[PDB]
Amino acid sequence: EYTGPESYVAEMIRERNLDWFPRMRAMSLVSSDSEGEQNELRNLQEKLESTMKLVTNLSGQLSELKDQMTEQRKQKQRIGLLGHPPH
Amino acid sequence: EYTGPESYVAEMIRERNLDWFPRMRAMSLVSSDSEGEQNELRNLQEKLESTMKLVTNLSGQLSELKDQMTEQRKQKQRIGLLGHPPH
Ligand SMILES: [Ca+2]
Ligand SMILES: [Ca+2]
């Protein structure tokens, strides 16, 4: 009928080990937080705006092929209409 | 005629409590700032460029449906004009 931690302590006792005693650490002092996790949120956010790379490149290319075909039509506006008028 | 803090000190005295005495803290040392709040500005800014998600997705979709209808017209430029010439 050993519980979870109780069985583990039992094997540590049978192992002649004393590493399960707390040393220079208390839960009341660890309960501080110190506005932590902020680094995790910053790191995920930095990748999220780094994810904006693929978000904005699709827009850039979809705009630019249309722009370049329109620019080809504009180039036609000059080159085709140059040879159209007679002499 | 008790003032704000004076009344509170009065009830602490009647409570036989000594927790209103400063201990290991001085205002002159707390007056440091240490370029603080920088984390708050960084956190708001990171969300603001995370707010750029919705700012740029509206642009992306408004560009892309126009691009895809133009591309459908371009697909017509081929498929419709393939079956138009006679034999
Ligand atoms: Ca059990
Ligand atoms: Ca009063």
Side-chain angles (χ1 to χ4, degrees):
Chain A
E1 61 266 35
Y2 279 158
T3 309
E6 160 174 355
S7 177
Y8 156 64
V9 165
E11 290 103 13
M12 294 299 291
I13 277 173
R14 282 204 293 260
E15 191 157 321
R16 296 294 86 193
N17 197 338
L18 276 298
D19 291 331
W20 60 278
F21 271 88
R23 179 144 181 210
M24 302 288 252
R25 289 183 294 170
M27 295 193 135
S28 311
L29 310 190
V30 166
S31 179
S32 60
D33 175 19
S34 304
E35 55 100 22
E37 185 69 353
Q38 290 295 33
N39 292 2
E40 190 270 343
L41 171 73
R42 166 189 55 90
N43 291 334
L44 63 86
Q45 278 159 325
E46 285 150 338
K47 291 290 181 69
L48 283 189
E49 288 100 13
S50 297
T51 301
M52 295 298 102
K53 286 184 173 65
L54 57 93
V55 171
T56 199
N57 290 318
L58 64 89
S59 67
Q61 285 70 241
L62 64 84
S63 54
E64 68 94 23
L65 73 165
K66 181 163 193 162
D67 194 16
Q68 69 91 31
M69 61 79 71
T70 306
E71 182 65 26
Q72 189 257 316
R73 183 68 179 88
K74 282 296 287 184
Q75 290 147 17
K76 291 287 195 174
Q77 296 294 321
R78 178 70 275 172
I79 194 163
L81 292 177
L82 187 50
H84 287 167
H87 301 280
Chain B
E1 61 266 35
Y2 279 158
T3 309
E6 160 174 355
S7 177
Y8 156 64
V9 165
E11 290 103 13
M12 294 299 291
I13 277 173
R14 282 204 293 260
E15 191 157 321
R16 296 294 86 193
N17 197 338
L18 276 298
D19 291 331
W20 60 278
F21 271 88
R23 179 144 181 210
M24 302 288 252
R25 289 183 294 170
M27 295 193 135
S28 311
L29 310 190
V30 166
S31 179
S32 60
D33 175 19
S34 304
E35 55 100 22
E37 185 69 353
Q38 290 295 33
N39 292 2
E40 190 270 343
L41 171 73
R42 166 189 55 90
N43 291 334
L44 63 86
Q45 278 159 325
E46 285 150 338
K47 291 290 181 69
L48 283 189
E49 288 100 13
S50 297
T51 302
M52 295 298 102
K53 286 184 173 65
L54 57 93
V55 171
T56 199
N57 290 318
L58 64 89
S59 67
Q61 285 70 241
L62 64 84
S63 54
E64 68 94 23
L65 73 165
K66 181 163 193 162
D67 194 16
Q68 69 91 31
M69 61 79 71
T70 306
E71 182 65 26
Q72 189 257 316
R73 183 68 179 88
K74 282 296 287 184
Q75 290 147 17
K76 291 287 195 174
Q77 296 294 321
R78 178 70 275 172
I79 194 163
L81 292 177
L82 187 50
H84 288 168
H87 301 280

